[PDB]
Amino acid sequence: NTKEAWWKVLWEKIKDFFFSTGKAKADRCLHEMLFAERAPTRERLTEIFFELKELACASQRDRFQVHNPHENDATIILRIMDQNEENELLRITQNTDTFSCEVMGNLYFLMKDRPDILKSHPQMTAMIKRRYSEIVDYPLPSTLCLNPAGAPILSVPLDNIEGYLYTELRKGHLDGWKAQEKATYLAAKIQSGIEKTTRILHHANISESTQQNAFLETMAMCGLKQLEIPPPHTHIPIEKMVKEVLLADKTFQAFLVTDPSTSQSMLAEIVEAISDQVFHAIFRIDPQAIQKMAEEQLTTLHVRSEQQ
Amino acid sequence: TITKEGMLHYKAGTSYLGKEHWKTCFVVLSNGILYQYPDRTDVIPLLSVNMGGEQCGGCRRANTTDRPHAFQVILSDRPCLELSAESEAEMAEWMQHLCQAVSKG
C-alpha cells in the first residue's frame, strides 16, 4: 500500500474489474504506466491499456473504449469509464507527435516522441495515424502522413488492410490465416536480422553454420515452426496486403515517382514499417524485438564459438 | 508576456551521493522558454530550455519519493529537471502550463 496518492484512489474504483491474479498484475501495469522511474513509450502505453482490458471481467470491458474525435484520425483517445459512464477514471490521448495521460482528470504526463518512420531519410516526414479495430481489439495503421519538401502533406487511407482481414474472417474461420503469418513473418524477421548483422560484421568470420544455428535457436525460443514450406498460396501476407493498399492511389503511386533516388529504396521501408505495426496489432509481438534478439543470438554464438 | 514564475525546490541540481539534496531554485516560464535561476535575482540561468522544441521531451508527475508535489521536465540531452512545488494545487498549475507549451512550438 506504499502506493501514490492518486494511485490508491484510481485503484479503489478499478480494483474490482480484476480478479485473483488479474488483480496483482493489473497493479504493476498501472505501475509501469504511471509511476515508474520514467514514463511509457507511446507504443508501450497502448500495450499497457489492452493488457488491462484483457485482465478486466468480460462484463467490465464495455468500460474500455477507444475513438478518434470527429472520426478524424490525427488523434486517438483511449479511456476507462466508471460504472455509470459518468466521468473518466483514465484517459490517454495520442496525437501526431505527442501523447498524454490523465487520471481522474489530473494531467499525469505529456510526452513528446518523434513519430517519423522515415528516419534514414532527413528530407522526409512520414507518420502513421491509427484508429481502433474491432477484429483485432487494438488500434491499427489507418492513415499514412507524408510530408515532402516538394508537396503539401499527402495523406493515404489504409482502411483496407483491415478490410483484407474481415474478408479472411468471413472465409475459412480466420485463425488459419493467423497461423501461417505469425510463423512466416517472424521467420522472415529473424532471417533478415541474421544476414544484416553478418553484412555489418563482415570482418569477423561468422560461419554459415552460426548463421544457420542461430536462426534455428530463435525460431525455437519463440516456439515457431517452418511450414511455411511449401508456402500455401490461398493465404495473402500482410507485407503484400500493404503494397496492394498503396497501388491504387493517384496520390501515392504518382508520389513514388518523384525524388526517385530514393525510388524503390524508400518504398520497402514504408511498406515494412507499416507491416510491423499491423502485425504487432495482431499478435502483440514487436517483430523488431525479435530481430534484435536474433541479431543478438548471432553475436553471442559467434562470441561463444571462440570458446568451443 | 509572462506565463508563470515562482519558487520551487529542485533535486536535479544536484547529485552528490547517498541520494542527494533538494535545493531551492527560482523558475520562470516566459513565452515558450523555461528559465531556471539559482535565486530571485541571480541573473545567470542555471539552465534554460525551449519547451516547444527538440531540447525537451515533455513532463511527468514524478515518482513521489521524499518530497510531496514532485514532477520533472524531460530533457533529451539528459538532465531530467527534477522539481517539487509547495502544494498539490501549485503543482497542478505548473504541470499544466509546462505541458501546454510542449504542445505548441
Q: Please provide the DSSP assignment of chain B as one string.
A: -EEEEEEEEESSS---SSS---EEEEEEEETTEEEEESSSS--S-SEEEETTSTTEEEEEE----SSTEEEEEEETTS-EEEEEESSHHHHHHHHHHHHHHHTT-
B58 at A interface, C-beta within 8 A: yes
SS3 annotation, A148-217: CCCCCCEEEECHHHHHHHHHHHCCCCCHHHHHHHHHHHHHHHHHHHHHHHHHHCCCCCCCHHHHHHHHHH
Q: Please provide the DSSP assignment of A88-123 as one string.
A: EEEEEEE-SSEEEEEETTEEEEEEE----S--S-SS
Q: Could you tell me the strand order of the sheet in which A106-112 lies?
A: A64-67, A76-81, A88-94, A98-103, A106-112, B56-61, B69-75, B80-85, B2-10, B23-30, B33-37, B47-50
Optimal mutation site among A106, A112, A113, A119, interface B, most CBs of chain B within 10 A: A112
What is the resolution in angstroms? 3.3
Polymer length of chain B: 105
B101 at A interface, C-beta within 8 A: no
| Residues of chain B positioned with their CB less than 8 A from the CB of A106 | 61, 92
B68: closest chain A residue by CA:
A5
Q: Please provide the DSSP assignment of A23-61 as one string.
A: HHHHHHHHHHHHSSSSPPPHHHHHHHHHHHHHHS-GGGG
Say if residue B5 is preceded by a cis peptide, omega within 30 of 0.
Answer: no
* A198 and A211 Cβ atoms separated by less than 8 Å: yes
- Among A34, A39, A110, whose Cβ lies nearest the Cβ of B103? A110
* A180 and A232 Cβ atoms separated by less than 8 Å: yes
Say if residue B65 is preceded by a cis peptide, omega within 30 of 0.
Answer: no
Domains of chain B: 1-105 (2.30.29.30)
> What cell does A108 get?
499525469
User: What Å distances lie between residue A35 and A1, A90, A178, B52, B70, CA to CA?
Assistant: 14, 14, 35, 25, 12
> DSSP secondary-structure letter at A284?
-
Tell if the CB–CB gap between A112 and B61 is shorter than 8 Å: no
Query: How many whole angstroms separate alpha carbon B37 and alpha carbon A236?
Result: 61
Query: How many whole angstroms separate alpha carbon A165 and alpha carbon A186?
Result: 19
Domains of chain A: 1-115 (3.30.2440.10), 116-172+231-284 (3.30.390.70), 173-230+285-308 (1.10.1740.30)
B63 at A interface, C-beta within 8 A: yes
| Residues of chain B positioned with their CB less than 8 A from the CB of A35 | 63
> DSSP secondary-structure letter at A262?
S
* A80 and A90 Cβ atoms separated by less than 8 Å: yes
- By what method was this entry solved? X-ray
Q: Work out the minimum CA distance from B61 to partner chain A, whole angstroms.
A: 6
Query: How many whole angstroms separate alpha carbon A150 and alpha carbon A123?
Result: 10
- Among A5, A39, A95, whose Cβ lies nearest the Cβ of B60? A39
How big is chain B by its Cα radius of gyration, in Å? 13
* A290 and A190 Cβ atoms separated by less than 8 Å: yes
Query: How many whole angstroms separate alpha carbon A206 and alpha carbon A215?
Result: 13
* B1 and B30 Cβ atoms separated by less than 8 Å: yes
Tell if the CB–CB gap between B102 and A37 is shorter than 8 Å: no
Interface A–B counts its CB contacts (< 8 A) at 44
* B82 and B102 Cβ atoms separated by less than 8 Å: no
